[PDB]
Design a protein around this ligand. Structure first.
Ligand code: WNC
Length: 346
């Protein structure tokens, strides 16, 4: 088998001439030449079978992406693995080769307002499809947004996704870790399990702010620091918004803080389009029930040049419940991954 940086990368003979790109959750990402379709592709190596949790993340993503079809979601073109469960040690997922990801792009490139508008439109258009499937992405961030050479955008990594469950979202204070820290909504640290669509809208708001300035808007240094950064910009929550937090530990933590003033968005982003800042404000709303929803965001005046609901499709077959991966030992999960990937054999 071909080898990349000392590690097996067993994709051949269809896929040749490999180059290292970067890193997925359970393995590396390479580009490769597809000798059948005569185009270069991206390939992610996954090695999950020694851990139940890794198998869960692998299976959820495969189940979701084998159903989803959308221009702003990077799909699965092929899946490579050994012909038998006994021999299967790794799984490789083959996807379109993009040019860069938004994390890397934002390290060195300033975006024009037209680019921010188009990128944000495409994020929300993809998100509308995801949420219409009753699914939450739950880890939206710049490195999960891929761009091709003409700046078409696709959303990557559904390994952390869940079926939405708003009626079971409440929990206690300082217990939840959903998403990546800088993109985590304030209620995750207060009283939410991350099972409502508003969790993703917050992340998109953080991404929009980051496109406006090339710096993360809420760069918490560690888990507990994150809420300091959010409140330092949004200011103290209103009485109404506190009254929506019935949990006493969370509400009393907020009541114990000194008053903090809101920082005006146009002072943080003096170059920004005023319509972009109005939408930013609605996405980064503290109260998740007041936070804008994906279809409202698409209709916002900032996006008027692109908005077209008839060209913003929804999912045919929403997911009705989570596949119930808890407590399934990794052995049954391996067998389920083997089964879900059979369509790509031989
Ligand atoms: C996309 C989800 C991930 O694994 C992220 O970590 C991602 O940032 C890794 C880099 O993914 C890239 C980068 C590119 O420049 C071009 C690509 O096509 C991809 C890619 O398709 O990533 C997919 C495999 C995973």
């Amino acid at each position: 088998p071909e080898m990349v940086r000392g590690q097996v990368f067993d994709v051949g003979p269809r896929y040749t001439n490999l180059s290292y790109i970067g890193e997925g959750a359970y393995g590396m990402v390479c580009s490769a030449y597809d000798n059948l379709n005569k185009v270069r592709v991206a390939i992610k190596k996954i090695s999950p079978f020694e851990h139940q949790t890794y198998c869960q993340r692998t299976l959820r993503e495969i189940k979701i992406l084998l159903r989803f079809r959308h221009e702003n979601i990077i799909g699965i073109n092929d899946i490579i693995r050994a012909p038998t469960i006994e021999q299967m040690k790794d799984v490789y997922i083959v996807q379109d080769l993009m040019e860069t990801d938004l994390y890397k792009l934002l390290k060195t490139q300033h975006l024009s307002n037209d680019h921010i508008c188009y990128f944000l439109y495409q994020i929300l258009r993809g998100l509308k499809y995801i949420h219409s499937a009753n699914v939450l992405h739950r880890d939206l961030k710049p490195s999960n947004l891929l761009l091709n050479t003409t700046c078409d955008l696709k959303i990557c990594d559904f390994g952390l996704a869940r079926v939405a469950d708003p009626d079971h979202d409440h929990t206690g204070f300082l217990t939840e870790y959903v998403a990546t820290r800088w993109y985590r909504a304030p209620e995750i640290m207060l009283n939410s399990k991350g099972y409502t669509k508003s969790i993703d809208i917050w992340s998109v708001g953080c991404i929009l702010a980051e496109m406006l300035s090339n710096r993360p808007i809420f760069p918490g240094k560690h888990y507990l620091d994150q809420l300091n950064h959010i409140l330092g910009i949004l200011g103290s929550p209103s009485q109404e918004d506190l009254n929506c937090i019935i949990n006493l530990k969370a509400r009393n933590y907020l009541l114990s803080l000194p008053h903090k003033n809101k920082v005006p968005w146009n002072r943080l982003f003096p170059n920004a389009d005023s319509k972009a800042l109005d939408l930013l404000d609605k996405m980064l709303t503290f109260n998740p029930h007041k936070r804008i929803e994906v279809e409202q965001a698409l209709a916002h005046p900032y996006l008027e040049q692109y908005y077209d609901p008839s060209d913003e499709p929804i999912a045919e077959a929403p997911f009705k419940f989570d596949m119930e991966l808890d407590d399934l030992p990794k052995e049954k999960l391996k067998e389920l991954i083997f089964e879900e990937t059979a369509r790509f054999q031989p």
